[PDB]
Amino acid sequence: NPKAFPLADAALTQQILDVVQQAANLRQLKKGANEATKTLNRGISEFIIMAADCEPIEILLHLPLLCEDKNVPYVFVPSRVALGRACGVSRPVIAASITTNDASAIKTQIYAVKDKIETLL
Template identity: 75%
Template sequence: MAGEEVNPKAFPLADPALSKSILNLVQQASHYKQLRKGANEATKTLNRGLSEFIVMAADAEPLEILLHLPLLCEDKNVPYVFVRSKDALGRACGVSRPVIACSVTINEGSQLKQQIQSLQVSIEKLLI
């Protein structure tokens, strides 16, 4: 699994350590009802200005089904990042199916605020 080539269009790709913190936060966001799963839902949160950041799976097939998201993120100034595995992303989202994209949504009084902000910073560093 680890040696698999990742589609170069899946940029920026989180390294294993960052992926771990991202998936961890996604899991918590799911508990706090601050998570929308799936490319369509992620698109909606972006259009409505509700997204803190977007996580996408680099192994989505074909990757093109996701590639409108980075453009939209840039448009809306929302950080975005790829993790390697849609299966891992699905697990983090608390479902037994692969998830190719999800959006962590804004909630003003959220207990996750600090973690979300520090991850946004890490993700933005990847984009430079």
Template identity: 65%
Template structure:
């Protein structure tokens, strides 16, 4: 059962950006720089730990994570929607679907340049 992508899911990453996002999420998971789930993503935003928020455009109902873009805008954190919660779950390294995840900042992280590059691509979508 796959959910339809909700038109409210904006900005939506295209296929090549989605692939890049999933690769980064997988690496962030390996480096312990990832929090999975809408609640965890909300906590990292509130605590100012978040570099980037990735949301699933096929979450049912989408409203369960629509507070996140507002919070991201308040905290100046870029966010992006990807097409599939199943794909996001796999990228996070779990077998369950994941509707939201947060990539964390970490001083001296080897992922920093990649996170910054992805942040810039995501910010371009928001303009």
């Protein structure tokens, strides 16, 4: 239970990273820690992803205290450069958030991912 607790295993990591990639290509993903907490207190955030190898860890560990307050699920993944490549962007991101949108084409995949991570927690 160290600090970044709901850390996904390999298969769930890979399916949340591929739904991250198609969300980023659909322009439904907002990336980075402060854009993540900005959309978190805007209220449009379906679930958030945080890379648990950042330098150091607290820079995104501020985000659970907002997200579990506002009742959105949150996952950790093991690698910033994996999240950066999956966001489709050149630098390593550490935090990412799926904006809620009913005009999405990825809605059922989003909901299946959400159900798996909520059963993870």
